[PDB]
């Protein structure tokens, strides 16, 4: 019973490779030989965010390109003005740790989350004048490693149970759920079109998830360890993802398959963040060996490295409009890098 | 302009206001010290808590002891999984790990599982900054097993019959000797792992602890301490 | 793709000798510390043995300590294991495990919670 099973799913996965080695007409690779490069990328810092005490774990880039969350694990979320760099809101958080935040593209919402398995929603409207808790979410048995705002009245979570969530904001409760892993799912990524997003967990794989039809499309297994970030490219037809092997992957959604890989003999340390830019042609990746290598996302060479860090980098956002790049890292520091 | 001089007015007040708070915060936040209160289910750390106190995913216990402020952080409902979670945790002041030592002649080899916990805990590479307390209980236990007719610890360790009571460790009166050879012995154990990697950087204090027991808040007062001030010394490059 | 393959087992004897192999394809195999975990039947996971990178540093679990030879083989690329002079409480299924992140010490890999990174697993009986 179990071997007709197991034999069944070794032939399916041998179709799945034999489709893949058909598919495999050539490399990107290869048909970029006559491309410019991109030349020594030299970003200079303009901005030093100081005022946490803690270790900074994640950030997030408003759609207006003008203000930014940062979150803490002294129990601190606070709301940042890039451009002045004024501090226009505080929370205290009831939990310490928070290993995720989001901050709503409506600018009315922002959400917070980590080990004490409840996304705290809070409203940034305030007609008291101060901020306040909107609404609490608890449904999961694991730790909450990421979240995401398709809108204002729905939210998309990663667990570690194995499982990601899709909320209802309005009720408090899941409207679906997403169940294909086997390991943590370290965190997610939402196509600009809002209809698919994929995920990354640590079982080397990366799964693509229809958020309206309520299960998974495509499994992508390139890797060797645990992938810990993941991001689109801006037109929603491939994406990256870094694990702790030391290799960034470039992977495509019609290809069905890898792309490329991006490695450097010199580097042996974990992945901890990436992020395209607004073009994409360049991929950004925030390394743990202190500093944040700027990659050539079309001939896999280094094009530049930023290294502002004293500890280890732990996230790294982009701004919608492309217009400069915050790196955050645990020695409670924002880098504003901006090139000139 | 007039208008964006009195947002930026505005701006610079809700920037000191929130300043103020930062710093009224921040001695709240660096007094208070952190401990990780890490153990196997079926040791008693159960019992650890409800002595400390004289759905939700992580537990928290607040106290203090002679005016210095503690919070203690049990791990709670979580998966077994514990490689990603684990590196939230370089910043805690000490990490206390309970394994009850379990010895009469049981579906696995619990000690061995314990060593193997604490190896990988002690060469981890975000947690070589992070002190490790270190509680065996269920010593009454240990000494109600030694009339079982038969040794497990022999059994699973074949080191033990070729290891003597040290010299230099004075045991409690009224104590049968195999118990206390058998307490060394473990106690050696963890000490030879802690002691192969010889980083210096942090420590492993081993104590001992009963089923029922007061002194165990002291200990971790004083392992505290210790710990403190063998960070200053650390900073003042003297050790 | 990560894929470990157990080889060998099957009912023996007691005082018997017996071989074990670990085919491991896809990763690169020489930077992974590994290790051999046993499952007993009707009770949890033990960690049996492990193995480093270059392969100086090994140990054993006590209760088969000096029974038991690890050794891995980084040009075939296959872990091998070879199990004399065998006992009849020693039957269990067998699971070849590898450690998640590549050049470390740590390892975290004990969990029953459908830990990714072992092999199906073969079965090891001793019949008297």
């Known amino acids: 019973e179990l071997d007709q099973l197991r034999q069944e799913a070794e032939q399916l996965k041998n179709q799945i490779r034999d489709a893949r080695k058909a598919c495999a007409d050539a490399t990107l690779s290869q048909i970029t030989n006559n491309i410019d490069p991109v030349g020594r990328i030299q970003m200079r810092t303009r901005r030093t965010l100081r005022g946490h005490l803690a270790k900074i774990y994640a950030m997030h880039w408003g759609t207006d390109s003008r203000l930014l969350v940062s979150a803490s694990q002294d129990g601190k979320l606070i709301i940042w003005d890039s451009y002045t760099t004024n501090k226009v809101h505080a929370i205290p958080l009831r939990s310490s740790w928070v290993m995720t935040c989001a901050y709503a593209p409506s600018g009315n919402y922002v959400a917070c989350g980590g080990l004490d398995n409840i996304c705290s929603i809070y409203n940034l409207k305030t007609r008291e004048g101060n901020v306040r808790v909107s609404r609490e979410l608890a449904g999961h048995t694991g730790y909450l490693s990421c979240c995401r705002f398709l809108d204002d009245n729905q939210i998309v979570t990663s667990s570690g149970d194995t499982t990601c969530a899709l909320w209802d904001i309005e009720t408090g409760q899941q409207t679906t759920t997403f169940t294909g892993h086997t390991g943590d799912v370290m965190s997610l990524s939402l196509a600009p079109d809002t209809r698919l997003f994929v995920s990354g967990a640590c079982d080397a794989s990366a799964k693509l998830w229809d958020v309206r039809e309520g299960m998974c499309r495509q499994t992508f297994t390139g890797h060797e360890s645990d992938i810990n970030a993941i991001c689109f490219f801006p037109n929603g037809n491939a994406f990256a993802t870094g694990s702790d092997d030391a290799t960034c992957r470039l992977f495509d959604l019609r290809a069905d398959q890898e792309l490329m890989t991006y490695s450097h003999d010199n580097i042996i340390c974990g992945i901890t963040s990436v992020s395209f830019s607004k073009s994409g042609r360049l991929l950004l990746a925030g390394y743990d060996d202190f500093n944040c290598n700027v990659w050539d996302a079309l001939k896999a060479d280094r094009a530049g490295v930023l290294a502002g860090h004293d500890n280890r980098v732990s996230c790294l956002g982009v701004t919608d409009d492309g217009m400069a790049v915050a790196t955050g890292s645990w020695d409670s520091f924002l880098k504003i890098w901006n090139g000139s | 302009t007039e208008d964006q001089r009195n947002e930026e007015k505005a701006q610079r007040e809700a920037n000191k206001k929130i300043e103020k708070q930062l710093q009224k915060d921040k001695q709240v936040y660096r007094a208070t010290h952190r401990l990780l209160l890490l153990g196997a289910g079926e040791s008693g750390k159960n019992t650890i808590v409800k002595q400390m106190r004289i759905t939700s995913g992580i537990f928290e216990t607040k106290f203090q002891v002679d005016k210095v402020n503690f919070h203690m952080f049990d791990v709670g409902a979580q998966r077994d999984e514990r490689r990603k979670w684990i590196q939230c945790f370089n910043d805690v002041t000490a990490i206390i790990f309970v394994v009850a030592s379990s010895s009469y002649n049981n579906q696995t080899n619990r000690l061995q599982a314990a060593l193997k916990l604490f190896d990988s805990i002690w060469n981890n590479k975000w947690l070589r900054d992070t002190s490790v307390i270190l509680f065996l209980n269920k010593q009454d236990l240990l000494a109600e097993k030694v009339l079982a007719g038969k040794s497990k610890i022999e059994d699973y360790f074949p080191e033990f019959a070729r290891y003597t009571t040290p010299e230099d460790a004075t045991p409690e009166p009224g104590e049968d000797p195999r118990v206390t050879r058998a307490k060394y012995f473990i106690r050696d154990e963890f000490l030879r792992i802690s002691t192969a990697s010889g980083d210096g950087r942090h420590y492993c204090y081993p104590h001992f602890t009963c089923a029922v027991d007061t002194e165990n808040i002291r200990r971790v007062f004083n392992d505290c301490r210790d710990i403190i001030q063998r960070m200053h010394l650390r900073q003042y490059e003297l050790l | 793709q990560v894929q470990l393959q157990e080889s060998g087992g099957g009912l023996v004897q007691p005082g018997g000798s017996l071989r074990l192999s670990c085919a491991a394809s896809?990763?690169?195999?020489?930077?992974?510390?590994m290790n051999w975990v046993r499952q007993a039947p009707g009770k949890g996971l033990e960690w049996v043995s492990d193995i480093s990178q270059s392969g100086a540093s090994i140990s054993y679990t006590g209760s088969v300590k000096g029974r038991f030879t690890i050794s891995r083989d980084n040009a075939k690329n296959t872990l091998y294991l070879q199990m004399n002079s065998l006992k009849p409480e020693d039957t269990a299924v067998y699971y070849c495990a590898r450690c998640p992140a590549p050049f470390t010490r740590d390892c975290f890999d004990v969990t029953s919670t459908t830990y990714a990174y072992r092999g199906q697993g073969t079965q090891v009986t001793v019949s008297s």
């Open positions: 896809g990763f690169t195999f020489s930077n992974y510390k």
